[PDB]
Design an enzyme around this catalytic site. Structure first.
Site, PDB file in Angstrom:
ATOM      1  N   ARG A  56       0.945  -1.035  -0.061  1.00 27.73           N
ATOM      2  CA  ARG A  56       0.122  -0.054   0.014  1.00 27.73           C
ATOM      3  C   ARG A  56       0.953   1.220   0.021  1.00 27.73           C
ATOM      4  NH1 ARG A  56      -3.000  -1.033   4.156  1.00 27.73           N
ATOM      5  NH2 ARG A  56      -4.297  -2.227   2.633  1.00 27.73           N
ATOM      6  N   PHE A  61       1.203  10.370   2.347  1.00 24.85           N
ATOM      7  CA  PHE A  61       0.789   9.838   3.528  1.00 24.85           C
ATOM      8  C   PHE A  61       2.003   8.871   3.874  1.00 24.85           C
ATOM      9  CE2 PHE A  61      -2.856   6.930   5.231  1.00 24.85           C
ATOM     10  CZ  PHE A  61      -2.471   7.165   6.671  1.00 24.85           C
ATOM     11  N   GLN A  64       3.454   1.280   3.108  1.00 24.20           N
ATOM     12  CA  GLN A  64       3.333   0.385   4.047  1.00 24.20           C
ATOM     13  C   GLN A  64       3.925  -1.232   3.501  1.00 24.20           C
ATOM     14  OE1 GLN A  64      -0.328   0.060   5.941  1.00 24.20           O
ATOM     15  NE2 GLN A  64      -0.001  -2.129   6.811  1.00 24.20           N
ATOM     16  N   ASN A 103      -0.382  -2.018  12.684  1.00 21.69           N
ATOM     17  CA  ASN A 103      -0.876  -2.732  13.764  1.00 21.69           C
ATOM     18  C   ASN A 103      -2.340  -2.800  13.341  1.00 21.69           C
ATOM     19  OD1 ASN A 103      -2.398  -0.974  15.406  1.00 21.69           O
ATOM     20  ND2 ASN A 103      -0.254  -0.219  16.208  1.00 21.69           N
ATOM     21  N   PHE A 114       5.399   1.032   8.246  1.00 19.79           N
ATOM     22  CA  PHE A 114       5.315   2.174   7.322  1.00 19.79           C
ATOM     23  C   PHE A 114       6.169   2.969   7.406  1.00 19.79           C
ATOM     24  CE2 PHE A 114       3.055   5.231  10.053  1.00 19.79           C
ATOM     25  CZ  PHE A 114       2.620   4.542  11.044  1.00 19.79           C
ATOM     26  N   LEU A 123      -1.317   9.503  14.723  1.00 27.96           N
ATOM     27  CA  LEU A 123      -0.762   7.965  14.854  1.00 27.96           C
ATOM     28  C   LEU A 123      -0.161   8.075  16.061  1.00 27.96           C
ATOM     29  CD1 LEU A 123      -0.090   6.720  11.445  1.00 27.96           C
ATOM     30  CD2 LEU A 123      -2.188   6.557  12.523  1.00 27.96           C
ATOM     31  N   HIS A 127       0.845   3.951  17.176  1.00 29.58           N
ATOM     32  CA  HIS A 127       1.849   3.174  16.522  1.00 29.58           C
ATOM     33  C   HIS A 127       3.195   3.349  17.090  1.00 29.58           C
ATOM     34  CE1 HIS A 127      -1.035   1.791  13.200  1.00 29.58           C
ATOM     35  NE2 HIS A 127      -1.661   2.920  13.778  1.00 29.58           N
TER      36      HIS A 127
HETATM   37  C1  UOD Z   1      -0.762  -4.679  10.278  1.00 26.29           C
HETATM   38  C2  UOD Z   1      -1.840  -5.133   9.438  1.00 26.29           C
HETATM   39  C3  UOD Z   1      -2.030  -6.462   9.985  1.00 26.29           C
HETATM   40  C4  UOD Z   1      -3.153  -4.173   9.605  1.00 26.29           C
HETATM   41  N1  UOD Z   1      -4.362  -4.876   8.795  1.00 26.29           N
HETATM   42  C5  UOD Z   1      -5.438  -4.881   9.132  1.00 26.29           C
HETATM   43  O1  UOD Z   1      -5.818  -4.173  10.117  1.00 26.29           O
HETATM   44  C6  UOD Z   1      -6.554  -5.602   8.016  1.00 26.29           C
HETATM   45  C7  UOD Z   1      -6.123  -6.645   7.516  1.00 26.29           C
HETATM   46  C8  UOD Z   1      -8.051  -5.565   8.700  1.00 26.29           C
HETATM   47  C9  UOD Z   1      -6.559  -4.118   6.977  1.00 26.29           C
HETATM   48  C10 UOD Z   1      -6.882  -2.703   7.492  1.00 26.29           C
HETATM   49  C11 UOD Z   1      -6.756  -1.757   6.265  1.00 26.29           C
HETATM   50  C12 UOD Z   1      -6.919  -2.179   4.965  1.00 26.29           C
HETATM   51  C13 UOD Z   1      -6.928  -1.035   4.083  1.00 26.29           C
HETATM   52  C14 UOD Z   1      -6.429   0.189   4.430  1.00 26.29           C
HETATM   53  C15 UOD Z   1      -6.215   1.367   3.370  1.00 26.29           C
HETATM   54  C16 UOD Z   1      -6.194   2.605   4.052  1.00 26.29           C
HETATM   55  C17 UOD Z   1      -6.037   2.817   5.492  1.00 26.29           C
HETATM   56  N2  UOD Z   1      -6.066   1.798   6.326  1.00 26.29           N
HETATM   57  C18 UOD Z   1      -6.281   0.498   5.742  1.00 26.29           C
HETATM   58  C19 UOD Z   1      -6.280  -0.484   6.732  1.00 26.29           C
HETATM   59  C20 UOD Z   1      -5.707   4.185   5.867  1.00 26.29           C
HETATM   60  C21 UOD Z   1      -6.822   4.785   6.800  1.00 26.29           C
HETATM   61  O2  UOD Z   1      -4.519   3.827   6.982  1.00 26.29           O
HETATM   62  C22 UOD Z   1      -3.396   3.364   6.669  1.00 26.29           C
HETATM   63  O3  UOD Z   1      -2.927   3.011   5.494  1.00 26.29           O
HETATM   64  C23 UOD Z   1      -2.634   2.905   7.963  1.00 26.29           C
HETATM   65  C24 UOD Z   1      -1.337   3.971   7.972  1.00 26.29           C
HETATM   66  C25 UOD Z   1      -0.332   3.439   9.166  1.00 26.29           C
HETATM   67  C26 UOD Z   1      -0.123   1.901   8.912  1.00 26.29           C
HETATM   68  N3  UOD Z   1      -1.354   1.059   8.914  1.00 26.29           N
HETATM   69  N4  UOD Z   1      -2.225   1.663   7.663  1.00 26.29           N
HETATM   70  C27 UOD Z   1      -1.882   0.103   9.681  1.00 26.29           C
HETATM   71  O4  UOD Z   1      -1.207  -0.053  10.575  1.00 26.29           O
HETATM   72  C28 UOD Z   1      -3.199  -0.551   9.584  1.00 26.29           C
HETATM   73  C29 UOD Z   1      -4.199   0.387  10.384  1.00 26.29           C
HETATM   74  N5  UOD Z   1      -3.380  -1.883   9.873  1.00 26.29           N
HETATM   75  C30 UOD Z   1      -2.979  -2.885   9.123  1.00 26.29           C
HETATM   76  O5  UOD Z   1      -2.735  -2.753   7.971  1.00 26.29           O
END
Ligand code: UOD
EC number: 5.2.1.8
Length: 165
Positions: A56, A61, A64, A103, A114, A123, A127
């Site tokens: 991602r 932003f 990840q 997380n 990330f 955050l 985090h």
């Molecule tokens: C660690 C992994 C197991 C976790 N996965 C999940 O919880 C599951 C599998 C349920 C997917 C969640 C998800 C998917 C698409 C998406 C799409 C967009 C966003 N958030 C998104 C979050 C957007 C608002 O925020 C982010 O991009 C944040 C940034 C910080 C790191 N970060 N993402 C996380 O730590 C997210 C919060 N946690 C996970 O990715």
């Protein structure tokens, strides 16, 4: 005297080399979290980041990565087990280049991480920040051009090699 470790990622775009990003890991402040990322970068426990992708990338932003067991953001594991606790929240998300744990709730750190490409202060305290880009922010910025608003990448962004310096 202890010296904070430095690790590197060699980044590729659809298999073509792009450049190197290196990171300082703040083992002086978050030793357990820094050690997990260090060991996953060397592969010395028999698993880790080599070959994995950035699943991602949202420009302006963060980028990840670190899901080497399901390759899409649903997996990964730490060197301590599937999950480990939030060590502390001493360090904050102050700007581009901060390295922080991804997380799914309290005390669920694994291997996903990330790299900030903006200040992400909302955050802070949820985090764990544990490092920063040292060299190669230009390479992170180049990676960012393959991201999109919804985070899907337009080319496959991989960690072709990684290790410790
Ligand atoms: C660690 C992994 C197991 C976790 N996965 C999940 O919880 C599951 C599998 C349920 C997917 C969640 C998800 C998917 C698409 C998406 C799409 C967009 C966003 N958030 C998104 C979050 C957007 C608002 O925020 C982010 O991009 C944040 C940034 C910080 C790191 N970060 N993402 C996380 O730590 C997210 C919060 N946690 C996970 O990715």
């Amino acid at each position: 005297h202890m010296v904070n470790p430095t690790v590197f990622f060699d980044i590729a775009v659809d298999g073509e080399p792009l450049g190197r990003v290196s990171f300082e890991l703040f083992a002086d402040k978050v030793p357990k979290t820094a050690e997990n990322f260090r060991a996953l970068s060397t592969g010395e426990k028999g698993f880790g980041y080599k070959g994995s992708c950035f699943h991602r990338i949202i420009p302006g932003f963060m980028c990840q990565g670190g899901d080497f067991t399901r390759h899409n953001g649903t997996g990964g594991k730490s060197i301590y087990g599937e999950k480990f606790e939030d060590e502390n929240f001493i360090l904050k998300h102050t700007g581009p280049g901060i390295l922080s744990m991804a997380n799914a709730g309290p005390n669920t750190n694994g291997s996903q991480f990330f790299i900030c490409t903006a200040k992400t202060e909302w955050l802070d305290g949820k985090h764990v920040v544990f490092g920063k880009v040292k060299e190669g922010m230009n390479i992170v910025e180049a990676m960012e051009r393959f991201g999109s608003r919804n985070g899907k990448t337009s080319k496959k962004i991989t960690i072709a090699d990684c290790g410790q310096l």
